[PDB]
Amino acid sequence: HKCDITLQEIIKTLNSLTEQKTLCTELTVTDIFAASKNTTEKETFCRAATVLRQFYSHHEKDTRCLGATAQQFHRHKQLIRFLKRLDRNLWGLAGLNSCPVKEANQSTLENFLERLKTIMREKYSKCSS
Amino acid sequence: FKVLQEPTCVSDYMSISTCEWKMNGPTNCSTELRLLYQLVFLLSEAHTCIPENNGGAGCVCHLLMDDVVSADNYTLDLWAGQQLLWKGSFKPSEHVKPRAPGNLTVHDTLLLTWSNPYPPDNYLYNHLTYAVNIWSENDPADFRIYNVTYLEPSLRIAAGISYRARVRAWAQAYNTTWSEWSPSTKWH
Fold this sequence. Notes:
Chain B: Belongs to the type I cytokine receptor family. Type 4 subfamily. Chain B: It is found in: Cell membrane. With about 130 residues, chain A is mostly helical. Chain A is about 55% helix and about 5% strand. The longest helix of chain A has 25 residues, at about 70-95. The longest helix of chain B has 4 residues, at about 30. Chain B has two domains: about 1-95, Immunoglobulins (Immunoglobulin-like), CATH 2.60.40.10; about 95-188, Sandwich (Immunoglobulin-like). Classes of the chains: A mainly alpha (about 130), B mainly beta (about 190).
């Protein structure tokens, strides 16, 4: 299906995320891009979705991530909202109900999202060559 | 009872999905039926929609979604007390009917202006095409339709009758149907 709306939506969110850092984008998550042994693209998308899921689930209510002003409060709110969108679309793209993560390597959420963006950028370039 | 017409739903891709169906023989939807709907995702919660009638044999239900993306799918279960009458699924992104533009007002030139009904962060926001309909109030048949793009929700017309104007919108990329028309306004 190449560049379907699911891919277009992921790219739009990736572009909207990078347009707002939160004090918490420095917290660390598992780096499933280290891709040590060989896994398929769907397993990667699935694992990425799963790593994003572990993050909003634990840090959505984290007061330390809210800052001190209304602008920073909504920034955390928007961030959490877009990560859920990212997760469900990547999970639907993978078409998998199971993808166990064993990777030890940690990564900052910002670098993780940066690396996902490179991968989505190459995927995207695949349907308008 | 029996469901004559299986539930068919449409989604505004923001916060509401409306489904409708038909059962055989008179039915009081709000007391007899319950449409349960749940996102098919590990993290989800079963929700209950209480229907209302659209005729003596017809029912309508408004499902509320907090946010919706392309991959999202919903399991829909129509229960009557403790009897499951029908079980199916609904993918919002494939049945998008957009919310209608509103706040349509009229201000040489003639300027019409209205509101995009979606917030900036909605995936639909930048995919909207507007169709503005103008017609001489004093006997229609003589009308014009102006297509306007997503970017700026306004229309400057130059071209003694009094005219009425309405505006609707659709989103090509999401292969949507047309929204309902906005309330219409008028000028001389």
